[PDB]
Amino acid sequence: ATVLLEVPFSARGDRIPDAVAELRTREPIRKVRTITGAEAWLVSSYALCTQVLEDRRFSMKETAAAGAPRLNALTVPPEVVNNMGNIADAGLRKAVMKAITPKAPGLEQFLRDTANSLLDNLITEGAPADLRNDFADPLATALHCKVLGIPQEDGPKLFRSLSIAFMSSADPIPAAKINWDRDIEYMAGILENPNITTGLMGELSRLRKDPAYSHVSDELFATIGVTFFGAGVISTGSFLTTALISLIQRPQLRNLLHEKPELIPAGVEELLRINLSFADGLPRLATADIQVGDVLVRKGELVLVLLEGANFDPEHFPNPGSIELDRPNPTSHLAFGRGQHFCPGSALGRRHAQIGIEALLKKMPGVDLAVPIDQLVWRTRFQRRIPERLPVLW
Ligand code: HEM
Ligand SMILES: Nc1cccc(-c2cccc(-c3c(-c4ccc(O)cc4)n[nH]c3N)c2)c1
């Protein structure tokens, strides 16, 4: 006898398991067991992934409900799960989204300056260089301090919460609450700080004293800061890191983008499509009985939307494992999700990766792994797949 298929399949972010395609073909929605011991429906075809994400009766918010089958333990107060919903209800959606666009004056130039400075330091220190800890993550951290309007020097301390904050754990994590409460107090202080007048926290600080928002809770304002910094930094840092691996593994693509940097946005869009940075499917709780393919999902059941299931589906992306810069449907991937909860930072995430890659290829046209690919150490039981270190030479 064998046990119910367990998720996740592999923490490796440099290859998709052959098992995913077998699953998609044979049973594109099927029962699995999560690390908590809960049962869930794993959805792995583009068609069924999109169906689930575009049907709000598959609820993000209700995944936080007491007694629900869980993908993993909450690392935040249950209300944070519905953060964007709470932002919307508070009338803050337009202002928040405006604050996190890459279109603010000097933002892209800041990204370029920061990336080039990071790379110059690596070149000065000499190979090997760690492109995660000393390039991608610092670039993400610097970007989000700028976007939030908080001091650059506060970034590192907020950043070191993230190795625990975005754990994918069977059980609650005591350190997560310690760091969360600390970071909330930091952000509360930021809102009271007269020096903070720019970025997301600068705008929230003003809206907080605007009579149109007098009954929005201080809790929510601080929570937006911590949530957006954390989610933004972990998502952009992790995506860029694993994108760089995919690029480095493709010298022909590396050279092409180096020679024709105008193709970098199309390249990044394909790197988004084949990205394995999300370690788990996106969780949703059914709030009704809903037919998904051959399965009638019952109210109260957990559904997991496997992004690489959708994004490597050959019925939507022919030759899915290949990076093709001239696809007819290039942005139709699910790297930023789909529907009600589509990533509000998608444009910023794109620009972070584009500018990071553009700068790297200019500074280090000969960039290559400095260790055999199998020697990368893949972080386990985490909401992202990332190598602990990414050693390169050039
Ligand atoms: C390459 C970078 C990024 C990737 C791949 C990414 C991916 C995603 C995905 C897949 C979702 C959907 C989650 C779900 O439906 O369960 C999402 C939502 C979200 N993202 Fe991102 N994201 C990125 C960058 C960012 C940035 C830069 C920010 C903020 C500064 C951000 C903030 C958020 C927030 C607040 C949500 C929740 C949306 C909602 O619930 O309505 N993300 N992201
Ligand atoms: N960019 C991106 C991608 C995926 C999710 C999010 C996002 C956006 C908003 C909330 C959440 C979220 C958390 C969470 C975990 C650790 C934290 O430090 C903050 C939040 N727990 N459960 C959910 N729902 C997640 C953002």
Coordinates of C-alpha atoms in Angstrom, one line a residue, residues 10-149:
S10 CA 10.1 19.1 -4.9
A11 CA 11.7 22.3 -3.5
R12 CA 14.0 22.5 -6.5
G13 CA 13.4 25.6 -8.6
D14 CA 15.7 24.8 -11.5
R15 CA 13.6 22.0 -13.0
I16 CA 10.0 21.0 -13.2
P17 CA 9.3 17.4 -12.1
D18 CA 8.3 15.0 -14.9
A19 CA 5.5 14.1 -12.5
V20 CA 3.7 17.4 -13.1
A21 CA 3.0 16.6 -16.8
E22 CA 1.9 13.0 -16.0
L23 CA -0.5 14.4 -13.4
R24 CA -1.9 17.1 -15.7
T25 CA -2.5 14.5 -18.4
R26 CA -4.1 11.8 -16.2
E27 CA -5.8 13.7 -13.4
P28 CA -5.6 17.6 -13.8
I29 CA -7.6 17.8 -10.5
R30 CA -6.7 15.2 -7.9
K31 CA -6.6 14.6 -4.2
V32 CA -3.3 15.2 -2.3
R33 CA -2.1 15.6 1.3
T34 CA -0.6 18.8 2.5
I35 CA 2.2 19.1 5.1
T36 CA -0.4 19.6 7.8
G37 CA -2.0 16.3 7.0
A38 CA -5.1 17.9 5.4
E39 CA -6.5 16.7 2.1
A40 CA -6.7 19.1 -0.8
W41 CA -7.5 19.2 -4.5
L42 CA -4.4 19.9 -6.6
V43 CA -5.3 21.6 -9.9
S44 CA -2.6 21.4 -12.6
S45 CA -4.1 22.3 -16.0
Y46 CA -4.3 25.8 -17.4
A47 CA -8.0 25.5 -18.0
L48 CA -8.9 24.4 -14.5
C49 CA -6.4 26.7 -12.8
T50 CA -8.0 29.7 -14.5
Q51 CA -11.5 28.4 -13.7
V52 CA -10.7 28.2 -10.0
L53 CA -8.9 31.6 -9.8
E54 CA -11.7 33.3 -11.7
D55 CA -14.5 31.9 -9.4
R56 CA -14.6 33.8 -6.1
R57 CA -16.6 31.0 -4.6
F58 CA -13.1 29.6 -4.3
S59 CA -12.2 32.0 -1.5
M60 CA -8.8 33.2 -0.4
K61 CA -10.3 34.9 2.7
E62 CA -12.0 31.7 4.0
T63 CA -8.7 29.7 3.9
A64 CA -8.0 31.5 7.3
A65 CA -11.2 30.2 8.9
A66 CA -10.8 28.2 12.1
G67 CA -11.1 24.4 11.5
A68 CA -10.5 24.6 7.8
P69 CA -8.2 22.1 6.0
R70 CA -4.9 24.0 5.8
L71 CA -2.0 24.0 3.3
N72 CA 0.2 25.4 6.0
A73 CA 0.0 27.3 9.3
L74 CA -0.8 31.0 9.4
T75 CA 2.2 33.2 9.9
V76 CA 0.1 36.3 10.3
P77 CA -3.1 37.3 12.1
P78 CA -6.1 35.8 10.1
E79 CA -7.2 39.2 9.0
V80 CA -4.0 39.8 7.1
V81 CA -5.0 37.0 4.7
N82 CA -7.7 39.3 3.5
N83 CA -5.4 42.3 3.4
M84 CA -6.3 43.5 -0.1
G85 CA -9.9 43.0 0.7
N86 CA -9.5 45.1 3.8
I87 CA -7.6 47.8 1.8
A88 CA -10.4 47.9 -0.7
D89 CA -13.1 48.2 2.0
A90 CA -11.2 51.0 3.6
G91 CA -11.2 53.0 0.3
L92 CA -7.5 52.7 0.0
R93 CA -7.1 50.5 -3.1
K94 CA -6.5 53.2 -5.7
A95 CA -3.9 55.1 -3.5
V96 CA -2.0 51.9 -2.6
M97 CA -1.9 50.6 -6.2
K98 CA -0.7 54.1 -7.4
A99 CA 2.1 54.0 -4.8
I100 CA 3.5 50.7 -6.0
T101 CA 3.7 51.4 -9.7
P102 CA 7.2 51.6 -11.2
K103 CA 6.1 55.0 -12.7
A104 CA 7.0 57.3 -9.9
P105 CA 9.6 59.9 -11.0
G106 CA 13.2 58.6 -10.5
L107 CA 12.1 55.2 -9.4
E108 CA 13.5 53.3 -12.4
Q109 CA 16.6 55.4 -12.3
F110 CA 16.9 54.5 -8.6
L111 CA 16.6 50.8 -9.6
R112 CA 19.3 51.1 -12.2
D113 CA 21.7 53.0 -9.9
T114 CA 21.2 50.5 -7.1
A115 CA 21.7 47.5 -9.4
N116 CA 24.8 48.9 -11.0
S117 CA 26.2 49.8 -7.6
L118 CA 25.6 46.3 -6.2
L119 CA 27.2 44.8 -9.3
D120 CA 30.2 47.2 -9.1
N121 CA 30.8 46.1 -5.5
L122 CA 30.7 42.4 -6.6
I123 CA 33.2 43.0 -9.4
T124 CA 35.5 44.9 -7.0
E125 CA 35.4 42.0 -4.5
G126 CA 36.1 39.5 -7.3
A127 CA 34.5 36.2 -8.2
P128 CA 32.7 34.2 -7.0
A129 CA 29.7 36.4 -6.2
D130 CA 26.4 35.4 -4.6
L131 CA 23.7 36.8 -6.8
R132 CA 20.9 36.1 -4.3
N133 CA 22.2 37.5 -1.1
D134 CA 24.4 40.2 -2.6
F135 CA 22.4 41.2 -5.7
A136 CA 18.8 40.1 -6.1
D137 CA 17.6 40.4 -2.5
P138 CA 19.4 43.6 -1.7
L139 CA 18.0 45.1 -5.0
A140 CA 14.5 44.0 -3.9
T141 CA 15.0 45.4 -0.4
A142 CA 16.3 48.7 -1.7
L143 CA 13.4 49.0 -4.1
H144 CA 10.8 48.4 -1.5
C145 CA 12.3 50.8 1.0
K146 CA 12.1 53.4 -1.8
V147 CA 8.5 52.5 -2.8
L148 CA 7.4 52.6 0.9
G149 CA 9.2 55.8 1.5

